Amino acid sequence: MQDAITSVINTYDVQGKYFDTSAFDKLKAYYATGELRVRAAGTISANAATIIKEASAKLFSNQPDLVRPGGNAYTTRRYAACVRDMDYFLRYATYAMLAGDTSILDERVLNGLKETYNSLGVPISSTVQGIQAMKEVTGSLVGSGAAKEMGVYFDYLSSGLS
Amino acid sequence: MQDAITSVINTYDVQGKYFDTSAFDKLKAYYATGELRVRAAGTISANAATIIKEASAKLFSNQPDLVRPGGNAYTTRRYAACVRDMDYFLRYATYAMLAGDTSILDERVLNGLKETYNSLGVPISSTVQGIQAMKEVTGSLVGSGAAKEMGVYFDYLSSGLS
Amino acid sequence: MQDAITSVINTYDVQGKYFDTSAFDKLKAYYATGELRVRAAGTISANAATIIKEASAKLFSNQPDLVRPGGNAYTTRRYAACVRDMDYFLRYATYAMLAGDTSILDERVLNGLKETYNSLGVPISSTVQGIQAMKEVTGSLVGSGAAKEMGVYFDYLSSGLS
Amino acid sequence: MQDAITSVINTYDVQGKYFDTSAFDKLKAYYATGELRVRAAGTISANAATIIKEASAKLFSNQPDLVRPGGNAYTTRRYAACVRDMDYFLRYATYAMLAGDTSILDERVLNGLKETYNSLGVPISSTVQGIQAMKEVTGSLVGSGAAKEMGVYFDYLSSGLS
Amino acid sequence: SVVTKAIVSADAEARYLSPGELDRIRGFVSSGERRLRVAQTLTESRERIIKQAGDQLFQKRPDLVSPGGNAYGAERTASCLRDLDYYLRLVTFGIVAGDVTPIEEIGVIGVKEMYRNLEVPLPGMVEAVKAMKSVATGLLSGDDSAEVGYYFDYLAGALA
């Protein structure tokens, strides 16, 4: 994976250049947002189970068909699989927020996810809606400061599926 | 996999419905045919080696070039693989007839079979004629009703390969 | 006409069956509501002139064009015939409520009524408004439990006219 | 492993004799107990969790030092290991009861358990007490004859660990 | 039923139901449970009633099942017994209805022509329904037996 610091390092290494003023500016920006990212990650670690609870409850309230007979989330096995996917999404969005980079999202989540969901018949729109529900719950818990940052990675994941 | 009983169960589970008179009628039909199915399966199992004997003999009589040098069934190894594939088809057709459903065929035979054979230069049409040879041999042993029954699954394999 | 009891008798007679547990359930349901129906019928019969007065006042207030020169309720003869028709509807609705069934409505009121009104020049929308007004007037006097049942037959008349 | 039938087959094969009257009597005796054994196995399968629950409760009630600091069962990890061992003992004694022979206990339970516990420092006497506790708990749920049959295998396990 | 009779009477006169008519309807619905258990009791014991009534009918009237009798043979005897079963079903319908209207209009109007076309003796009907009365009022208590016997008497009079 790649984070903001390693991204700057790679950019300047490809050019064979020592760090100039712009590079130090970007590094200062990441170091300045670091404590906010760490607080958000700690809060999400503390409340991940609650986040998945409330996000799944909201998604299944808006789309009751998903957990009723005939829905893709109707069985104990498929309900557990849905919750496991949402747990994936939350944990990896937390990783991407703590890194300040969406590379880990591409290289551990989105690669082949659309093909997997299309092979299984998993509805992409409802998965995107569940990611929005996670976005709302997580943004409410982390606070206004980190909500905007966390929504960036949730939106990245949603746009990757949709 | 899936059988007739499990097929009715899944149809009513997707609807979230307890069994109706139609479901009980279908279940009674399967229970009515169970004894004929068991007799056909037993007589096929007792005579499987003979069926393969004759089917391979007819296929290699009609298509000598398969077993002439340079043919796809020319080596002891490739000939053995050929008759092994025919025994595979017979065993899984017996499984499907005993189950009363063709889902095992799609799941455990046809899935990836066409491109398996295309990556190997196995003649798919010749395999289809081998399957009709097995059909003709099996029908004469199992009797008229069981012949019409086994023909459904043999034709299913033939159509999936074609 | 047929009541609830004779409706159950019909359903079981066409099938050549003695009464089942469901038949006894329906007969219990009708017997349980009997005193309510008798009380409501007594109340309606006591206040029939009053109910017709409020219903006609509301109808002619909302549609003064019926009683203006050239309306269908404009003459003493035609005003009297209008309030007479409202008497018809109230009395037959009381009959049907006592019977627990709408058969008497179909056979004695609605049969040919639409074409009769069309030939007479009687406005059917205004007649439905009068019937509805009579429904709200009656429901207040009979009480909620009786009003819910009586509105069934009033709405049956309104739908048959529409 | 070997069951009662296979045990008779081996004892007659190693001596190279055909089944005499005594062998057939032993096989009849095993077949007679089959329904009782199947009922007991089903009952234990239904109630295995509860048996482990209340047997572990009795064991740690009689020896509170096992689960207090300094005891061999003092941690969530070591308590989990203890209850896992008791569950495996119950399930394997149930297997042996179904089979009618203690070969599975030697091959899959006592095979290295004594000296594995010796290496781990597990107290053998407390393990024997736990096995006895499961013995009374299972007997209460399975009744007289099934309790005697289970007690045979429980005492075999107790001797093997001792 | 009682409600239908009262409503039809009130309709032929173009009036609301009288206080007495509402009183008879109140009494009818108040006694619905007892007559409902009466119908339940008669319905549970259909087979025994029909079998015993047929036995007494054929013992009282051997000529019906003798050669040349209308109910001679197994299948005609079964037709006899299922007519009796029809009438027991109508009697249960009348019991729940509170009047003999279901009996009157399912198995009375045109019964003479129907049984004349079938060469069925109407007297035989009469002792058949009397035997069914005896069997059916045997199983019921005194008040229930009298109430049911009124319907059976009405049927016997209609066939006569």
Added chain:
Amino acid sequence: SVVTKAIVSADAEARYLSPGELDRIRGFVSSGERRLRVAQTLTESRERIIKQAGDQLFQKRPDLVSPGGNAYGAERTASCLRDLDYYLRLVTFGIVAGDVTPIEEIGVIGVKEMYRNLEVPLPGMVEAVKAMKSVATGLLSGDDSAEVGYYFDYLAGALA
């Protein structure tokens, strides 16, 4: 299904079904009509079984509908009874299937994670299915009660 299990076991060994498995299939196919009778009997008493089982569960575990419980309130109790109805339908499916497979892929795989996400107590689920066992086996003959209690015990052990 029993046939599915036999075929799957035979396929794992890459062989045809032995005469033992064919005899097992003949036995199940011969018991099919009794299984269908039991399934119909349970299905017809759907509402009675669910209502009585809920009553016994809530009296045995009052804290479930007590404040602070997972089933507190009208709608959560309705969801509780809906879950019981699901599992009753699954039990009838298992009865006709002759084994607990459909019960397993519909209601047992992942039920732990599901009810954890729903903060539904698994023990309370176990007393619920035991109450269902009592109620449902009460309406069947002892022989049929045996096989039905077998599936209910599989469910209780799977949830526990």
Added chain:
Amino acid sequence: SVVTKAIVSADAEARYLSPGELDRIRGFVSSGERRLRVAQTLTESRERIIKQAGDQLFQKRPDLVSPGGNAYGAERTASCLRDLDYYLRLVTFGIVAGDVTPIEEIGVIGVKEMYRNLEVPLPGMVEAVKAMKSVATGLLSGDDSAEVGYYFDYLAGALA
């Protein structure tokens, strides 16, 4: 046997037996008695089976006992008939067990290597087993013949 195979299958997934698996064991222990009678009948008539099978084999395959054949000689013919006795005992074991597992694990694994070391022709063994099946099925009734010939056919296929 079937019980052992079921127990091993369940221990593979570390679970108690399913209700359907217990039903399978119930069917096995129900058929146990008829299997015992069949094996009793086979073990009583072992001498005549061996005599007839050996005679039929040697008449069909004279080269075995002819000079230059493997079975030529009194002691070698005794060894041949002793092998037939072994395989009959194994067939009885398989019949009581209900599966070919004892048959295989005493006399099928390594049988080709053993008979290769012994110069024993495999087609001769196949013909011996076939003649032995013919005699055994001749002595048994119609019902027993199918399952008894099943194990003999398995053994012949193992040798072939």
Added chain:
Amino acid sequence: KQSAEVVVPSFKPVTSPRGMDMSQTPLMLQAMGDIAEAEQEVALQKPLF
């Protein structure tokens, strides 16, 4: 590192096919024929009246 694509994303379920209910199968048709005879017999064991 030839490709980052997933070779086997998942296996497409065979739970439901489109068409071929197999209820028109002549064996199943004979089954519905024989259940009718069974029902008729059950009707005949009833009393004739």
